[PDB]
Design a protein around this ligand. Structure first.
Ligand SMILES: CCCCCCCCCCCCCCCCCC(=O)OC[C@H](COP(=O)([O-])OCC(O)COP(=O)([O-])OC[C@@H](COC(=O)CCCCCCCCCCCCCCCCC)OC(=O)CCCCCCCCCCCCCCCCC)OC(=O)CCCCCCCCCCCCCCCCC
Ligand SMILES: CCCCCCCCCCCCCCCCCC(=O)OC[C@H](COP(=O)(O)OCCN)OC(=O)CCCCCCCCCCCCCCCCC
Ligand SMILES: CCCCCCCCCCCCCCCCCC(=O)OC[C@H](COP(=O)(O)OCCN)OC(=O)CCCCCCCCCCCCCCCCC
Ligand SMILES: CCCCCCCCCCCCCCCCCC(=O)OC[C@H](COP(=O)(O)OCCN)OC(=O)CCCCCCCCCCCCCCCCC
Ligand SMILES: CCCCCCCCCCCCCCCCCC(=O)OC[C@H](COP(=O)(O)OCCN)OC(=O)CCCCCCCCCCCCCCCCC
Ligand SMILES: CCCCCCCCCCCCCCCCCC(=O)OC[C@H](COP(=O)(O)OCCN)OC(=O)CCCCCCCCCCCCCCCCC
Lengths: 344, 51, 63, 120, 459, 47, 42, 97, 27, 139, 100, 52
């Protein structure tokens, strides 16, 4: 990429979420969403492999129709209130549209089909951006409008996502898609507490970002899109085997690690609000997510899979190092739990 | 302290431990002597009942 | 040091824990009230800036 | 939640009102934890990059133990404020709306009669 | 209680920093002394429990265990110096640290005031244990065993998480001290009848009940000796400690919500005891012995009579020490024999004279010989169970007859009969093997002299 | 030595001085902030 | 004299294939090309 | 207007049903997608015009400017697809399964 | 007539009571 | 919607007809929705084949609906105890069995019975204890 | 077939180091890993520990209660009071629900 | 909004034109300019829960 283009695109992919967050005029929030859509598509097809064009053409159609639905909500509001922004008075259907639409861009629940497929055809790098710096934008729009959205729908999309994400993940063996599925799940918890305590959505996101960003830079350190590929981690780079183990169990909710806090406080907030029906079912299938996380643990760490002879050749050569971010985001993530009170 | 710096690790933990457990007392010192069963009046030249 | 220290220490531990418990419950009641009442600093949702209206002489009578 | 409060500083980290609160003792267990959390980050880095774990980057080890800790004092300083605002806010309401949070009289056990289920 | 804990943490720095050749002695020697500091908690010259500080407390029920948890780390590190002596010098220092963290975590869990501190530390102990079982497990099936050990505990665990957050909202603090001195009386609704099950089920799972105990036979089979010692001696008892402190609340329901478990346990005690009678794997038989002798405990922590409780406290500490002793000697046969089969290796006393004396005393502890805390324990649970219903003696009476039979069969077909003709010649006994045993039984003899210390909260 | 020399054999002396020097600026600002803070706290309140 | 059983080739095999728990039809599915580039052309 | 505003809204839903029920060629979809932007542009312009809200007319056009590029990206993906398959049928986009 | 503004909680901040009242974090 | 709700208004065990009708509808509605997702994804081969599947799923679901309704109502009638999770469990027990049959599998009937019945029982308890599902934020 | 190592035999550590104590292969580490384990294990835990545990005084007050009983039984019997009166919390203190 | 970089920076690129009573070009007040004013000077200082 002519480095100039790289700058323009990257600026847009970054001006995209930032305009959304900063503005209050919904319109300006919509174009923030629109830019993000335009900026991400070029990077998605960088290899320009036949799989890639498929990825982008899906991502784009799914993103575009949702963008149009979000605009329709703003256009309708404009006629039910002269304001260009959702208010207490807003017709309920107007808000529900925004939930469905925004739940498509974020890819939650019954609209979770595009994400796993685009996460499969894009590079590991652009995978991260597509999973974590593109969720900030839509979520911002929701978090702003939380007082007004429906508790019922969110919960249904929340629970569905948790289930779909979990069930989908169990079968998958491609890593990119295992992560895509996890993101659907975590995204679910986040949207469950939005109606009740938005501030916790912003924790269940950061922690997801501080967990997923190290996890993916791990997958690419050896650029392994297969579990079999990550399983030979012990030969290619032995040290990351320890933290890859804890980060994945952290992604699932197991108690000593940082990953428990988001689930724990979301459950505490939902029980405070009396959803002890919903919270219980979510926590239970949340346990399904750890099963596929630990199955990967087995292959990568607790058991040593056999390796090819050429692996000795790659050992010889100095391994290009993992950026510092890995460490700082691996530790702050695997073990901050002793510092939970200040996080929330 | 040479080649013996790995023998004074655990022992040192103990001391630090005792330093904290006697510091926890310092914090939880309300009802110092204000408890009912043990509320004696200060004996001459004694600062506080239990330290 | 004695029976005195633990008895008095345990009572201090109970007072902190009793007072923390009463406050945690009162929070949940205050937070129920301000959400529905909207009469307290928490849960004060926004409505558009008054500063952006225009009470200036318009171009038509009757604004 | 706490946003929308009167006087809210729209983008500030810790409003000066937080000056009134005590500063976090530098050795607060938490800041000390952040320190250890940091040292470990450093050690971990050395490990992932295949360097002598402890005897390398003794400059970095310091940057880490000293970056994390620096961050702590100024974060904890805030989180401490946020919690302190929460009481100001909470306690105040209990009073301004007194009737809703009425003091209750608890009958001495002598009076109350909890039923006795025998184990037998 | 930060001397039983901080000095413990520092063990981790010592296992890592120390020389590869000297790593073993620094760690084992120091934790022996760590146990000596643990003995200070036993100085209770008054009834008042010792609330060290806000988060850390030790009452009669926890103190007898914290000392056992600190005591076994030395022993665990002495029983795994053989296997794990074939490792790369960084696999060892990981195993040693894993064992160290278990008692750090277990010491805190047994010494925790806030019930959810119990939960976080409670369910954390699975991480160190699963690594010990899966990473170093000899058999092809440990991946499976690890899954069983993680899911059975985890599915039970999330209900307890919801329940404890639930009581905090209902009462306003999960502090065991207050919860005790506050009025929490459930109201026998249909919902409460569920709360009770939510709180007890997670504890009932790791304390193998007849219905959910399949995890323990599978786990101890492929687990390394140190993991099997930890699971039998401290890990299973985590479930019992939890049931004692959690049933302070949920006071009214267990009067009538316990029948299901009580009957599950007493019939379970008979069947688990009996299948020990024909099981070819020795580690298998000890594990089911552990299920049955722990089925007695869930039937005393539910009858809830003063004697039951301390019968339970007596038996849990006693059976913990005895089971390990049995799992430790089973390993010594396994390492020379190279097979877990009970039928092979017949006649060992002829070739290992002393280990057989340790085998005999371990079996007599296993069955209830009378000048032993093991018998005092069962005698007491038996008494209360009889009080609950005189008929209970029949079922707790078929178990005693069966328990005698399998305990002696382990001695009769492993340590007597004609010697096996020529298995790989059995090298003589190391002094470590014998001490690891002596260290288990000498405390069993000393505790039996003064049973008062391990009697529980009730008495 | 190495046929392909390391890129790190002799220290990046800049990376030392911005790593060491940065940390010593952190402390001198941090310790300053605390004592300064303590004072503000004391005067802003009773003492 | 002990070799904790490290996984053999066969244990590894299962984790290959585009789906772990293959269905009767989904069994036909073939692992995606490692290069992320396909052979189709015409 | 209230009456008409309905027709435009259903036009957007009929265009919604279109883009959410593909059939062969993609260019049809993208084309449908555009049918919505026209309906949104018409509705935004209509209400702005009968609310005499001139401060908002900027939006009716910002909507079109962003929608045009959006479509530009969409068509470049389309050209990319009938360069890799040469038939532009939503039918062959299934490698990712 | 317009409605009145929500009342204003008043005073100065004092270190929070008993500290973060989180789960057993004696803070 | 005033309809479905009616199921709850009249005391359980009474007016089984209405109960069975309502329960049958809900199952059937779910059948349609379920078939729809089943046809939209994993499509059929011929329109008729899919119309059949819609029918199959609809009927099976309608059946589980009926037997649940019928069994629970009658169990309560015969047992004379209106408020008892057990009534529903027997009902859920039956419902699962119908599913098992339609799927021609004894095993499914097993899991079906336990899982389905338990769920229904919990519904009864839920109603009896006034459990709130999808609650409004009241913090 | 794939490449893997041939089964490693287990050494008869008792063939060399005929004084093997079971802790480590080289002899001096072994000796110094039992001279410190029997010592810290038996010599100052089973001995010093049992000494200290034996001398814990009046554990859980059961040495105090066998005297307090004796003076209460001494006092109650001589003054003619019932040795264990039948209600503990005095009836006067209790305010029984009056109606029922 | 989520990140108020506008109030902080003091800039008002997105607030001046959110309601019908905002400054209309050439001071051509829109329909309802009277009401919306009356409905937002009312709900100013009173949060939504009590602006409803
Ligand atoms: C080792 C290096 C030590 C360096 C020492 C440097 C000198 C020094 O700090 O001494 C003076 C300084 C003086 O302290 P102080 O304030 O006078 O002590 C009195 C406090 O009241 C006593 O402290 P406190 O109890 O008031 O502190 C409040 C709070 C403080 O909170 C904390 O600091 C937590 C620290 C946890 C470690 O308490 C808690 O710890 C609550 C959390 C308890 C654990 C909750 C999580 C349990 C599950 C997860 C366990 C950890 C899992 C990690 C992830 C998995 C890793 C594989 O000592 C310290 O502050 C450090 C104490 C030890 C800190 C932890 C070190 C490990
Ligand atoms: C709350 C407790 C939570 C659980 C704590 C205990 C479990 C820690 C997590 C373990 C997860 C991984 C398990 C499997 C690890 C396999 C490691 C392995 O195969 O060895 C190679 C690896 C890297 O090798 P390298 O260091 O490059 O040199 C040796 C080359 N063969 O060698 C290494 O990786 C060496 C470094 C390993 C990491 C050391 C960790 C030590 C144990 C940490 C315990 C922390 C306890 C905290 C207690 C808190 C209480 C409040
Ligand atoms: C468990 C906590 C261990 C803390 C040890 C502190 C002293 C130290 O520097 O050890 C680091 C530890 C061992 O490192 P080293 O001595 O070089 O030998 C193994 C090389 N992989 O290697 C480690 O990094 C252990 C800590 C791993 C991170 C988790 C800590 C909890
Ligand atoms: C498997 C091992 C055993 C697990 C048992 C799990 C039981 C269900 C989870 C915990 C249930 C529970 O917390 O019980 C109490 C709760 C209602 O309790 P309560 O606070 O009285 O609410 C009514 C207020 N008037 O009642 C409930 O929470 C009902 C929970 C409904 C979901 C059941 C579990 C579904 C799992 C998938
Ligand atoms: C008086 C005694 C009453 C007992 C009532 C419960 C058992 C009733 C059994 C009736 C016969 C069921 C049967 O034969 O089918 C077994 C079922 C399907 O088996 P399948 O492999 O499909 O082959 C069946 C070919 N006819 O396979 C199954 O899924 C069976 C599921 C039900 C199992 C019931 C017994 C469970 C016992 C658990 C004990 C736990 C301790
Ligand atoms: C938590 C612990 C719960 C413990 C429950 C124990 C129940 C045991 C029942 C006996 C064992 C039955 C069994 O395991 O069969 C598995 C079954 C085998 O397959 P088969 O029955 O032939 O049908 C295949 C359909 N794909 O595999 C299947 O049939 C799977 C598909 C049928 C699922 C039936 C259950 C549906 C529950 C719906 C609940 C709705 C609310």
């Amino acid at each position: 990429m002519n480095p100039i283009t790289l700058a323009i695109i990257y600026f847009t992919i970054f001006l995209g979420p930032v305009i959304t967050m900063s503005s209050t005029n919904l319109m300006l929030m919509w174009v923030g969403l629109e830019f993000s859509l335009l900026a991400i598509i070029p990077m998605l097809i960088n290899k320009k492999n036949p799989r890639s064009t498929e990825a982008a053409t899906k991502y784009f159609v799914t993103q575009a129709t949702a963008s149009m639905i979000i605009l329709l909500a703003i256009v309708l509001n404009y006629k039910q209130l002269g304001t260009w922004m959702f208010q207490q008075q807003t017709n309920g259907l107007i808000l529900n549209m925004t939930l469905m639409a925004l739940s498509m861009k974020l890819g939650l629940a019954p609209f979770h089909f595009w994400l796993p497929e685009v996460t499969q055809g894009i590079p590991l790098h652009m995978g991260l951006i597509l999973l974590t710096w593109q969720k900030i934008a839509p979520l911002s729009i929701l978090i702003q409008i939380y007082p007004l959205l429906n508790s019922t729908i969110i919960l249904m999309l929340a629970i569905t996502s948790i289930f779909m994400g979990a069930w989908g993940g169990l079968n998958q063996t491609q890593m990119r898609k295992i992560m895509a599925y996890s993101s659907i799940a975590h995204m679910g918890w986040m949207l469950a507490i939005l109606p009740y305590n938005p501030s916790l959505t912003l924790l269940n996101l950061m922690i997801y970002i501080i967990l997923t960003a190290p996890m993916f830079m791990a997958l690419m350190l050896n650029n392994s899109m297969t579990i079999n590929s990550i399983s030979l981690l012990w030969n290619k780079t032995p040290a990351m085997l320890t933290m890859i183990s804890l980060m994945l169990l952290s992604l699932g909710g197991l108690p000593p690690l940082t990953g428990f806090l988001p689930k724990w406080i979301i459950i505490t907030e939902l029980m405070k609000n009396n959803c002890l029906i919903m919270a219980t079912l979510m926590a239970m299938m949340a346990l399904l997510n750890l099963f596929f996380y630990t199955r990967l643990i087995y292959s990568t760490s607790l058991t040593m899979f056999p390796t090819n002879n050429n692996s000795k050749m790659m050992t010889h050569q100095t391994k290009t190092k993992p950026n510092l971010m890995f460490s700082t985001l691996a530790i702050m993530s695997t073990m901050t739990l002793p510092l939970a009170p200040q996080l929330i | 302290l040479r080649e013996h710096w790995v023998h004074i690790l655990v022992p040192a933990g103990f001391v630090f431990g005792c330093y904290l457990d006697r510091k926890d007392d310092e914090k939880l010192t309300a009802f110092r002597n204000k408890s009912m069963l043990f509320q004696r009046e200060l004996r001459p030249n004694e600062e506080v009942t239990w330290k | 040091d004695g029976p005195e220290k633990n008895y008095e220490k345990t009572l201090a531990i109970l007072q902190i824990e009793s007072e923390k418990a009463e406050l945690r419950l009162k929070e949940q009641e205050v937070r129920r009230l301000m959400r529905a009442r909207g009469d307290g600093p928490w849960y004060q949702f926004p409505t558009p800036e008054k500063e952006f209206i225009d009470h200036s002489p318009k171009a038509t009578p009757d604004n | 939640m706490m946003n929308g409060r009167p006087g809210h500083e729209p983008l500030k980290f810790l409003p000066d009102e937080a000056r009134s609160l005590p500063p976090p003792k530098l050795n607060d267990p938490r800041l000390v934890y952040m320190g250890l959390l940091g040292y470990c980050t450093g050690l971990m880095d050395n490990m992932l990059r295949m360097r002598p774990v402890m005897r390398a980057g003794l400059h970095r080890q310091l940057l880490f133990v000293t970056s994390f800790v620096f961050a702590g004092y100024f974060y904890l300083k805030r989180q401490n404020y946020l919690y302190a605002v929460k009481d100001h806010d909470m306690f105040g309401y209990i009073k301004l709306h007194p009737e809703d949070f009425p003091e209750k009289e608890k009958k001495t056990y002598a009076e109350i009669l909890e039923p006795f289920h025998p184990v037998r | 209680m930060l001397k039983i804990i901080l000095p413990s943490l520092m063990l981790l720095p010592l296992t890592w920093l120390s020389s590869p050749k000297k790593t073993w002695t620094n760690v084992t020697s120091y934790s022996f002394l760590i146990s000596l500091t643990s003995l200070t908690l036993l100085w209770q010259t008054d009834e008042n429990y010792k609330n060290f500080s806000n988060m850390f407390s030790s009452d009669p029920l926890s103190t007898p265990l914290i000392i056992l948890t600190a005591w076994l780390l030395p022993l665990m590190l002495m029983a795994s110096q053989n296997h794990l002596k074939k490792d790369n010098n960084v696999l060892q220092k990981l195993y040693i640290s894993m064992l160290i963290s278990l008692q750090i975590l277990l010491i805190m869990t047994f010494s925790a005031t806030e019930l959810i501190m119990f939960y976080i530390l409670f369910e954390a102990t699975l991480i160190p244990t699963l690594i010990i079982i899966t990473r170093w497990g000899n058999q092809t099936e440990r991946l499976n065993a690890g899954i069983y050990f993680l899911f059975y505990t985890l599915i039970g665990s999330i209900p307890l998480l919801i329940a404890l957050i639930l009581i905090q909202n209902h009462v306003g603090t999960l502090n065991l001290m207050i919860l005790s001195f506050t009025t929490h009386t459930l109201d026998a609704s249909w919902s409460n009848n569920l709360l009770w099950l939510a709180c007890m089920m997670a504890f009932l799972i790791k304390m193998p009940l007849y219905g959910v105990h399949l995890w323990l036979p599978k786990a101890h089979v492929e687990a390394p000796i140190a993991g099997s010692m930890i699971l039998a001696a401290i890990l299973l008892k985590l479930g019992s400690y939890g049931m004692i402190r959690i049933s302070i609340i949920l006071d009214p329901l267990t009067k009538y919500m316990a029948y299901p478990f009580i009957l599950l346990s007493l019939w379970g005690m008979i069947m688990t005891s009996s299948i020990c009678l024909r099981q070819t794997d020795l580690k298998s038989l000890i594990a089911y012995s552990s299920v049955s002798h722990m089925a007695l405990v869930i039937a005393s922590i539910m009858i809830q009579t003063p004697w039951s409780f301390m019968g339970a406290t007596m038996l849990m500490i006693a059976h913990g020490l005895t089971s390990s002793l049995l799992f430790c000697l089973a390993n010594s046969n396994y390492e020379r024999i190279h097979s877990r089969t009970m039928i092979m290796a017949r006649g060992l006393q002829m070739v290992f004279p002393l280990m057989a004396t340790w085998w005999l005393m371990a079996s007599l502890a296993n069955l209830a010989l009378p000048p032993s805390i093991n018998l005092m324990g069962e005698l007491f649970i038996t008494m209360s169970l009889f009080s609950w219903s005189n008929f209970t003696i029949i079922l707790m009476g078929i178990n005693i007859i069966i328990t005698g039979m399998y305990s002696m069969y382990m001695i009769i077909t492993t340590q007597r009969g004609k010697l096996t003709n020529h298995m790989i010649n059995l090298q003589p006994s190391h002094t470590r093997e014998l001490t690891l045993m002596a260290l288990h039984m000498i405390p069993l003899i000393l505790l039996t002299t003064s049973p008062k210390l391990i009697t529980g909260l009730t008495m | 030595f190495y046929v392909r020399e390391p890129v790190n054999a002799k220290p990046n002396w800049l990376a030392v001085g911005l790593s060491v020097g940065a940390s010593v600026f952190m402390w001198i600002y941090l310790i300053q902030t605390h004592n300064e803070d303590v004072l503000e706290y004391k005067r802003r309140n009773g003492l | 004299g002990a070799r904790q059983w490290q996984p053999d080739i066969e244990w590894a095999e299962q984790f290959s294939g585009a789906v772990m728990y293959p269905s009767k039809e989904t069994a036909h599915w073939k692992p995606p090309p490692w290069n992320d580039v396909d052979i189709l052309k015409e | 207007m209230p009456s008409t505003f309905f027709n435009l809204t259903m036009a957007f839903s009929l265009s919604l049903l279109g883009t959410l029920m593909f059939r062969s060629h993609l260019m049809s979809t993208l084309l449908c997608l555009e049918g919505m932007v026209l309906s949104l542009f018409i509705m935004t312009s209509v209400t702005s015009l009968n609310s005499n809200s001139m401060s908002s007319m900027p939006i009716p056009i910002t909507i079109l400017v962003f929608a045009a590029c959006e479509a530009a990206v969409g068509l470049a993906l389309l050209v990319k697809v009938s360069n890799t398959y040469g038939t532009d049928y939503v039918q062959n986009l299934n490698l990712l399964q | 007539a317009r409605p009145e503004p929500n009342p204003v909680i008043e005073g100065d901040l004092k270190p929070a009571k008993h500290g973060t009242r989180f789960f057993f974090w004696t803070v | 919607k005033r309809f479905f709700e009616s199921y709850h208004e009249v005391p359980d065990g009474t007016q089984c007809h209405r109960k069975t009708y309502i329960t049958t509808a809900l199952g059937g509605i779910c059948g349609i929705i379920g078939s729809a997702y089943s046809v939209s994804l994993n499509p059929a081969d011929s329109t008729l084949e899919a119309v059949a599947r819609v029918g199959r799923y609809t009927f099976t679901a309608a059946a589980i609906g009926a037997m649940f309704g019928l069994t629970t109502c009658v169990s309560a009638q015969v047992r004379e105890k209106p408020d008892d999770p057990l009534n529903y469990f027997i009902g859920g027990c039956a419902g699962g069995l119908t599913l098992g049959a339609r799927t021609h599998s004894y095993g499914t009937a097993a899991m079906g019975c336990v899982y389905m019945g338990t769920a229904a029982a919990l519904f009864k308890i839920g109603k009896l204890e006034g459990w709130e599902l999808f609650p409004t934020p009241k913090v | 077939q794939w490449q893997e190592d041939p089964e490693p035999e287990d050494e008869n550590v008792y063939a060399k180091n005929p004084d093997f104590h079971g802790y480590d292969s080289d002899p001096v580490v072994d000796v110094w890993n039992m001279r410190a384990v029997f010592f810290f294990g038996f010599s100052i835990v089973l001995v010093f520990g049992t000494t200290f545990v034996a001398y814990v005084p009046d554990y859980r007050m059961q040495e105090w209660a066998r005297r307090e009983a004796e003076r209460l039984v001494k006092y109650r019997e001589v003054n003619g009071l019932p040795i264990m009166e039948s209600n503990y919390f005095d009836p006067s203190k209790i305010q029984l629900p009056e109606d029922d | 909004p989520f990140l108020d970089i506008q109030k902080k920076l003091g800039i008002s690129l997105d607030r001046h034109f959110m309601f019908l009573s905002a400054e209309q070009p050439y001071k051509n007040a829109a329909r309802c300019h009277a009401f919306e004013k009356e409905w937002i000077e009312c709900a100013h200082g009173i949060g939504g829960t009590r602006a409803k």
